[PDB]
Subunit: 32 residues, 4 copies
């Protein structure tokens, strides 16, 4: 219930870390 929310948050933080890495590779590529 509440722990199910905490687990979903940790999943959502992992998904936003992969998005910030891929946004950083796209900024890199645009910068070349």
């Amino acid at each position: 219930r509440m722990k199910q929310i905490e687990d979903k948050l940790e999943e959502i933080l992992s998904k936003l870390y992969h998005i910030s890495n891929e946004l950083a590779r796209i900024k890199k590529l645009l910068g070349e």
Copy 2:
């Protein structure tokens, strides 16, 4: 190549909509 960046922006925008949906589900579960 620029096409490859535009496609990865489209995949990011679709993953951003999935997370906003998940966090709206959680904000519902909290009210």
Copy 3:
């Protein structure tokens, strides 16, 4: 407390809507 979390979520959803709009304008601009 719990309502403070619900309010922060609504703030974070508004911030991710402005990021998805600006990512969409950047995709538009790259597409021209």
Copy 4:
């Protein structure tokens, strides 16, 4: 102009780090 897109990617990445920090604070507040 491409410089303007790279700067707005940098502002998005800095706003993405602020949201992940906020959602880590909330996941702390829930444990």
